[PDB]
Amino acid sequence: QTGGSFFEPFNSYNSGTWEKADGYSNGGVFNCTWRANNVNFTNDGKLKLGLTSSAYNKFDCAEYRSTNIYGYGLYEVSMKPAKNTGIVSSFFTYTGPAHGTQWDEIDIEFLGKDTTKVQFNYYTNGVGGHEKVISLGFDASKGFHTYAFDWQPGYIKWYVDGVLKHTATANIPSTPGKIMMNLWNGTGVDDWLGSYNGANPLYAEYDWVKYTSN
Template sequence: MYYFSSPAVLLSSIAGLAILSNASALEKRYTSPTAPFDGCLWQVSKVGAFNSHLNVSNWKTLPSSLKATDRTGGPARVKWDPSLVGVDANDGSLTLTVPGGQGTCTDDKPCGSAQITTAYDDVMYGSMRTVMKTPNVWGTVSAAFFYSDDNNEADIEMQTGDVTHAHWTNQDWYGSNGLTNTSVVANTSAAYHEYRLDWVPGRTDLYVDGKLLQTYTKFVPRTSGFWMWNSWTNNGSWTLGPPSMDAVMHIKSIDVYFNRTSIAGCGSA
C-alpha cells in the first residue's frame, strides 16, 4: 500500500438512530449501467438528466475533481489526515485508513481518519455509485454520502465490525434527528459491492448491488454541497472505536452523475 496527499476540504458525516431490517441478503456485486450522454446532459434512467459526470477507477493519483480532507473536527475528536489516503498495491483500489492502536480519541489528541470529497461544493442532485468494501474490524465507520450541512445530508454508512448491515440516513439534526434505517446486506468486507444513492427533489433512493433497499421522502437535502467518502473513528457510541488494528476501507470505483449549480448548461466534472 502506498499513500498520496492532496489539499484541504471540508466537514463530515454523523449517523443515526432507528432500525428497520430487510431480510433479503445480497450475494454478488452488480454495477449500475452507464448513463448515455446526449451531447449536453447525462440521462440516468428513471432518475433524471445531469450536467456533470465523475468516473474514477484508476487511483494512481487523485483527479483534480477530488480532494483529501486536511483538518481537525467534524465530527468531534477526529483528525482528517491526507497521508491516510492511499492506493492498494495489489488491486489498485483507493484506501482510506484508520490506524490501529491510537488510544482514546480526545479533543487534544484526535484520532487519525481519512476522507475524500469533491473539490467543489455546488453539487445539487445526482446518482452516486461507489464500489467498495469495508474493514472487518470493529471501531470505525465507512461512509459514502452527500453533505451540505448537518440539516442537509444523505448517508450510506457501515459500522465496520458489523459486516452484514448498511445504514441509510437523511439527517435533520436541527429538527427531529432525521431518519435512519438499517438493511441486511451481503458481507460488506468479504467482497466489493456497489452502494448507490440517488438524490432528486423530494426523494432519496438507496441501493446495494442494484437492489432498491430504502426510499425516503422526508428530510431530503435541499441545498447544494459535496459528495464525500470517508473512514473514521472518534471512540463515540457510533464508531465504537478506535480500532485495535489498522482499519482499511477500499474503494474500487466511483461513478457519479450530478448537477453543479455553477454550470448553466452543458458541462463535465
C-alpha cells in the same frame, strides 16, 4: 446549475477533483485526526483509506472530498468497508455551515461492528434522524459491492447491487454538496457504534465512484 456526471476509476490523480482532510480532528464524536497520509491510492486503482495509531490511544483516520458539489441524480460506489467495533466507513454528500449553507447530507454507513448491515440516513437543514438499517444478506467487507442512492426532489432511493433497498419520501435535501468518503473511530456513541477497541491498521477500499446527473 452545478457539477456534471463523472466516473472515477482511481488510477490517476489530477487537479480540481478531490481533496483530503489533514492535520485537524472534526472533534465531538470523531476520535481521530484526519491524515492526508492515510489516503493511499493503489496501483490497481482503488482508494485505500486507513485507520492507524500514531501513539498508543492516539489514532489517526482518513477523509476524501470532492472540490465541486453535486446535486440531484444517481450516486454509485463499489466499496469494501472495514469490519471492527467502534468505527464507521461511509460515502455521503455534504454541505454545512462549514460551506456556508443549510446542513444537507444523504448517506450510506457501514458500522464496523456489523457489516452484514448498512445504515441509510439523511439530514435536511440540520434535521436528520431518519436512519434505516437494512440487512444486506452478505458481509460488505468480504468484497466489492455496488451501493447507489438516487437523490431526487421528491424521494431518495437506495440500492444494494442494483436492488432497491430504501426510499425516502418526506423532506428531502436540496442543497448540492460534496461527495465524501471516510474511515473514523468514535467516542461517546458506544451505543451506536460499539466501543473502538484500539485495533489498527484498519482500511476501507473504494473501487470507483460515478455520479450521473439528471
